[PDB]
Design a protein around this ligand. Structure first.
Ligand SMILES: *[C@@H]1O[C@H](CO[C@@H]2O[C@@H](C)[C@@H](O)[C@@H](O)[C@@H]2O)[C@@H](O[C@@H]2O[C@H](CO)[C@@H](O[C@@H]3O[C@H](CO[C@@H]4O[C@H](CO)[C@@H](O)[C@H](O)[C@@H]4O[C@@H]4O[C@H](CO)[C@@H](O[C@@H]5O[C@H](CO)[C@H](O)[C@H](O)[C@H]5O)[C@H](O)[C@H]4NC(C)=O)[C@@H](O)[C@H](O[C@@H]4O[C@H](CO)[C@@H](O)[C@H](O)[C@@H]4O[C@@H]4O[C@H](CO)[C@@H](O)[C@H](O)[C@H]4NC(C)=O)[C@@H]3O)[C@H](O)[C@H]2NC(C)=O)[C@H](O)[C@H]1NC(C)=O
Ligand SMILES: *[C@@H]1O[C@H](CO[C@@H]2O[C@@H](C)[C@@H](O)[C@@H](O)[C@@H]2O)[C@@H](O[C@@H]2O[C@H](CO)[C@@H](O[C@@H]3O[C@H](CO[C@@H]4O[C@H](CO)[C@@H](O)[C@H](O)[C@@H]4O[C@@H]4O[C@H](CO)[C@@H](O[C@@H]5O[C@H](CO)[C@H](O)[C@H](O)[C@H]5O)[C@H](O)[C@H]4NC(C)=O)[C@@H](O)[C@H](O[C@@H]4O[C@H](CO)[C@@H](O)[C@H](O)[C@@H]4O[C@@H]4O[C@H](CO)[C@@H](O)[C@H](O)[C@H]4NC(C)=O)[C@@H]3O)[C@H](O)[C@H]2NC(C)=O)[C@H](O)[C@H]1NC(C)=O
Lengths: 209, 209
């Protein structure tokens, strides 16, 4: 052995930005022994102990240790407000409890600029065309970009991960591919962007023929 | 112990596409023991044994095994022609020699389309502007994208890794950032792209005010 290790993970960006999703912080304890398998978790939100976390059943691993996980749902507004979530792990194999703390990225937020680009000339002779959504100058990097048309999700797009720019902000592109048909008939397509620094955390940019 | 393991690595895309660079295949042998440290390499180019590989001095590792590496330079035209490079590793701890073979990606090549985009409206009021180079529909993914102006490299750009598209081809974008000055005075900037499927393996797209 050697004592357990603790890793603390943030919620997913899309869960923090959507009212219908459940953002969670996850405190993962590994190298928990057969002899001392009991793990106690204490959770604090800016120092105030909360009691509504849920510990998953211990999971035996291939190397003969346990993985013990505790999951705390965070209020969407608390995460966005920069509250700090501390997981304290107690176990009889540890010399003292281990604490980890996480919170949203801390720099000044910066709102994305969003532009849509119509299909490149070479594609007007093909069966499918691509529309582009350029999203740049945002911070932090947490963001969600989708496409829709007639209020339905389009699913055929691919978005780069955010890329760190020299000025400390991020940029990305998303590319939607649609049947040329749909474009030539004047259907309106929109790039949706959800990011904390936008007004109302959301913006859309629309285009058509 | 358990016997040595072999990993074979391709040359870098930029080395294969530039006449002044040295593309190499690298045969890496790990978990070589103190007792049987001697490693013999045989190399073959489409079955023909070649004798100009160079074995690096054995390198002792932190876990008390050796890492032994052999490096074979490949002719630029041979790699592009799809020749297969086989590394055969013999060592007294192995039941039989181990062989690995690698070659360029095998699908049909497909030439990139390249477009440059001038600065977004929001930036005309800033100190720096970004120019964009969109490169799409290429295959294989090996490619090199740079920027220049007045025949000198511009170094302030960032290029995404190739992204796999639904149609089996790749796309990427490169973004150069320059002082607004330079753009407003009419300097010409160009996106260079080197890819095997372009005519003469190279193309440039240029833009200015
Ligand atoms: C016995 O086995 C145990 C189990 O191992 C597995 O079993 C076998 C089969 C074998 O295959 C193993 O390889 C298997 O993993 C071993 O446990 C492992 O221990 C090691 C450490 O020793 C852990 O390593 C750490 O890994 C994290 C990476 O976090 C994960 O991603 C990995 C790899 O992709 C994945 O395996 C993990 O499970 C984690 O996945 C994430 O899980 C979270 C939580 O569940 C997901 O988030 C949640 O998802 C939900 C939806 O699913 C909701 O959205 C919810 O809201 C959300 O919270 C998340 O999606 C998921 N991610 C992915 C990709 O799946 C590394 O980050 C960690 O990093 C390092 O820390 C190091 C110290 O170890 C340091 O060296 C490194 O540089 C690095 O970075 C620094 O770390 C510091 C912390 O010390 C940081 O402070 C610092 O900021 C940071 N620096 C920088 C610059 O960033 C480390 O590598 C590994 O996770 C354990 N595996 C598991 C499954 O738990 C055990 O080791 C072994 N024991 C023995 C004795 O052999
Ligand atoms: C004792 O120690 C040894 C040394 O370990 C280090 O020491 C300590 C300090 C500790 O920190 C270790 O963690 C250290 O690494 C151990 O050796 C390691 O063994 C493991 C396997 O057990 C190796 O793991 C493999 O790793 C490759 C990844 O290849 C590397 O990238 C890694 C990580 O980024 C890097 O560490 C390596 O050095 C390799 O780097 C590349 O090196 C090449 C060659 O030098 C560079 O190319 C050259 O570069 C030149 C310029 O520099 C020129 O350009 C030249 O032209 C060019 O050729 C290259 O740039 C560089 N890349 C990077 C990023 O640096 C994995 O690919 C490999 O993959 C897997 O294979 C698995 C089986 O193991 C399989 O499970 C996986 O899924 C995976 O994928 C599949 O693999 C199949 C092969 O089996 C493939 O057929 C299949 O296609 C593929 N599938 C798919 C879908 O893709 C595997 O993980 C590791 O490389 C070794 N480390 C080193 C340094 O050599 C040793 O294990 C340990 N022993 C014991 C008993 O403990």
């Amino acid at each position: 052995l050697g004592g357990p290790s603790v890793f603390l993970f943030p919620p997913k960006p899309k869960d923090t930005l959507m009212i219908s999703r459940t953002p969670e912080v996850t405190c993962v304890v590994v190298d928990v022994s057969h002899e001392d398998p009991e793990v106690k978790f204490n959770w604090y939100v800016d120092g105030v102990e909360v009691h509504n976390a849920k510990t998953k059943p211990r999971e035996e691993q291939y190397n003969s240790t346990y993985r013990v996980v505790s999951v705390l749902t965070v209020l969407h507004q608390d995460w966005l407000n920069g509250k700090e979530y501390k997981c304290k792990v107690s176990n009889k194999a540890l010399p003292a409890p281990i604490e980890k703390t996480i919170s949203k990225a801390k720099g000044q937020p910066r709102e994305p600029q969003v532009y849509t680009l119509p299909p490149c000339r070479d594609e007007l002779t093909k069966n499918q065309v691509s529309l582009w959504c350029l999203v740049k100058g945002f911070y932090p990097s947490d963001i969600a970009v989708e496409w829709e048309s007639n209020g339905q999700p389009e699913n055929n797009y691919k978005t780069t991960p955010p890329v760190l720019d020299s000025d400390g902000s991020f940029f990305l592109y998303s590319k939607l591919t649609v049947d040329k048909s749909r474009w030539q008939q004047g259907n309106v397509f929109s790039c949706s962007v959800m990011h904390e620094a936008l007004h109302n955390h959301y913006t859309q940019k629309s285009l058509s023929l």
